[model samples]
Target chain A: PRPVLRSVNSREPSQVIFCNRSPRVVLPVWLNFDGEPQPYPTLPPGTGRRIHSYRGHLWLFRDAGTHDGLLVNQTELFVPSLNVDGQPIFANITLPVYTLKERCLQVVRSLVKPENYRRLDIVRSLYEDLEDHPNVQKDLERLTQERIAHQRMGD
Target chain B: SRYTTEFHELEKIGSGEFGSVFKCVKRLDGCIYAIKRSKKPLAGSVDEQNALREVYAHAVLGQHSHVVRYFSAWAEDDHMLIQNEYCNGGSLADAISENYRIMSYFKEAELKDLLLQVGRGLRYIHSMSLVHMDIKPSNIFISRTSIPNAASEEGDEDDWASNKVMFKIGDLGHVTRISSPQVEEGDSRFLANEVLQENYTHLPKADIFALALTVVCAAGAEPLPRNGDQWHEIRQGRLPRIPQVLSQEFTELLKVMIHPDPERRPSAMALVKHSVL
Candidate 1:
């Protein structure tokens, strides 16, 4: 058996208008029944293509040069949905972005999660993102110190 | 966020002390890959630093047939995400366990094939002045594929022996430069005596020792003791028992590989060139 997972075929027919919104040229790929990638023609930035596909068909967009994936509305894979009475579905590919504060908060929230609270490595790495935020840094340090002391007492 | 967006998570393949691994399909190529995500954020702690170090090691080593392929790595939501080759044949450790269940062992020919491939991988790492501190069976992956036999002019006969298995070294988190200040220890069951004694003079030999034990395990030997007289005896270069299946020459080679003195142990390159291999 192949290690790669396979895609399924469906009877419901559909059409999709895939548009490249990223700055780079993107390759549109269709996952065949074997789950192998079959690349169609490359789409330049701002260009669009009308693909004849089936509902539940899996599609992906990638950077032509780097081959890195271009997110489609914040996701890597795109599955076509059922068309409405022969209407074509529209999908756009875009790059990923996160603001500096947003990135920092994402790290902070993950660090403070119950499963990760005492994970010193997570605390330290996430702390680096908020180095300028002294209040948050102080609180993290205090928490780490408490854990350290608690372990010492147990020992 | 980026990880979830960039790849379609298929299933959780493994979970360990450091992280969880998922079989994912990359959005770009629609290709399958093994994605490892740290359980916690990488930070100043030694374990955390090792996670980052693994990324660096992959970058420096690039690609090799005997080494697990590394694609890309990134940090998302404080967890380090690593994309690696997805080996279909599980690991040598898995094979050993399965063999044990069947009361069978890796044949002599199979062992030679494994030693040659893993030795070549180790040689490549050693050439780069790096030592793969972890060389246990679990860290050695097996990738298998079947080749079609050419059509024969004579009567057609089914060819069932066309499957090819390739071994690749993985789990580079514990890998480090030969002379690095940070000394990391690997699994105690496979650790060399020098490392156990805190002697870092011959770092590469440590890997040799581990590989020897791995071979012994593949030959249907019982799991190495974690700690006890037997564990200490094995650490001191006195193997609990050598598998009777191994030839005398191969057995001699294992003797040198597990030699207590690091200087006496053969280098990975030497093992690859040995007549027995």
Candidate 2:
């Protein structure tokens, strides 16, 4: 026979979350699950965001503006310290930042397989190590202010 | 590719209150898939939520052999595309219409074999704390395989007898967490009295009621003799009448399944071990 009437209740699935604690650093983060890599999401400094992913993912995180920053490559990215209820948990990870053009040359050279490597199209962009450019930062901020002023005047 | 156009649509297979089902082939691998598209497309609509929910549900439970398998899903400019394994054998409703009409087409033993497969599926679904509210002949699908005696030890009662006829439960749009009393609505005849009254919040017994109705219909008997719909009789606790052609054991089993009171009806797990199956 079937069981009698019971009280109704609902359950929700669990989730993962990532947090950026460094005030000056924006976090560039992505993950690979099963065998596929997901699109990247940029995490603003001093902000926390929930990650929509199943368990067992290899997560890679790097500081914004450079490929050589302290990169945290982790397998099975989960920690009991970081729960989903607004409790802030931080594991201070510091790594060196470096440029990518020379690094990628080594990566491309290692592809010895002739069948598929030649089809790879490579177009490159050069970037400055923005850490040493405070004047450039002031000019960019001034440009943004002028743009906002111009938009206000036009409106 | 980040698009649904990657799959070439072939022809329409089925349609219902919510959406239309189509048979499609993946251009990348020349593989066939069944694609379901919702009727109405809206920006941030409830249909979008339902599609995401189905994706999540499939991720959790699609690997089971008795459950229909989902491959991929995407949102187009106007509609959502949900890709699943192509079960070309069609639904059990189609089977009953095409082949299993009379006693001569299908025997009680064959019915038992099919029901056993369904019971196994229901057991797995219930074990995951999910209730498939839409348990009808139309949602039950047959999957054909060429390999004879494939996984023979896993509930293959008639594996040696028949080379085909592997039934899997599909259409998970109405799936919800078990033990919730909020009724999303189902076929009236299969709907439990408590659900109709909107007073009780039990689980799975309503599904059992519908399963019994499906059994009677698939057995070439009317769950109820009527001109069209007999929802009035169902509302008043009138159980479906089984024909005399079915054995006493099968009749009794159907009676327990269609019991008026949810408390008196057997759970899917209990029925999985029932002698009738």
Candidate 3:
């Protein structure tokens, strides 16, 4: 249970804008706010969603293709926002979530499913400190380009 | 045509950023109108742009039972004036502030009818790709005159006119092009989350969220629990805790209308069909 990257910068927004950057994978994300676990919406590849930010939270990302899950600790702060008129774009709190919990952990079950947690995309990009191999290095550059192209399509 | 000569200006009702609104009398018909006069001329300025947009949007809406009826507009003394229906019963917020037994005043039947009118107006506006960015009790207007009492009814059982409490949506100043970004203003109690997040994407359902908040106010309940700088809770996508007195059917529809995820909220027209409504 490694501590995920935490946000201390005042500029970090309180909203966790979760986006599926992979070009070919739908990511299932679960959230735990202040130690309270909650299931979040499944993000299709190239799609984006917003989740609540907290003092301390965890992002449990699952690969849809392989059905693997990994928990990443996180937190966020509110960034004062405004519409074009310099007024807050939104007001009031959103409705609270009252959805019934699911007993089956089908989407985000084991933290290191399918073995080799180090190979997970989130780990490679966020955690693993392994020395870059020639093959991994070459693919990483191409993968970055491919992800940018996919994001452009989303726009 | 000149508004100065056509309409007689009366005492001012309320003044805001752009201009002062006066309760005016139409010279020809001798009818009262809520006349919004620009603080200055409708020149090519930012305030004029907003004034012009409101005039055009009001005109496009034409006349509908549930909508604020737009009559005419004119320039007088270098200022612009637009005339619309004046609901003398004051705003829903005013009514609630009076503590007029709001919770028990309107039972299930009346509440259903009242919300239907609002729903109809919102649906029509949405069909035109418009979002009443400011949907709250303050903007909802009751018609001139009180609803006939239901208890005095040996021979008036079928009096349909008095049985209904007419309400209309007014104050088009904050209307946007279905989620278009603009300087926002209004009660935070009624705004949707994406709006606070500055998500500029088109979201007509955002109005539905505000409409639901209005419903809560109508029921004599605060939309959100007591909190300071509510953005802390709002930013996290939290909805209000509905009172138990509200029917389960209504609470269900309320749940959907004010969902944290904007995409889940139904369109005004779709909301009109909800079992409770």
TM agreement with the true structure for every prediction:
0.61, 0.55, 0.54
Name the candidate, 1 or 3, with the larger lDDT value. 1
Q: List fnat per candidate, in order.
A: 0.00, 0.00, 0.00
Residue lDDT tens for model 2, B44-132: 86555555556666987859889989887776666666778998777777666644332224568878987798889888988888888
Give the Å shift of residue B183 in candidate 1.
1.4
Residue A6 CA displacement from its true place in model 1, Å: 20
Model 3 regions more than 4 Å off: A1-155, B1-4, B9-11, B16-18, B41-46, B100-106, B144-162, B179-187, B223-244
Residue B208 in model 1: shift from native, Å? 0.9
In terms of lDDT, which candidate is strongest?
A: 1
RMSD list, candidates in order:
22.3, 23.9, 26.7
| Candidate 3 structure quality by residue, lDDT tens digits, B1-277 | 4666667877778877767888878777798888877756446666665665677678777777888888777765767777788877678765665444323233566668767888988888888878778677778888744232212223432212332357888878777775455645555656666776677784576777777667766766654543366644643445455343657877777677767777777777676786665
Q: CA lDDT, every prediction?
A: 0.73, 0.59, 0.57
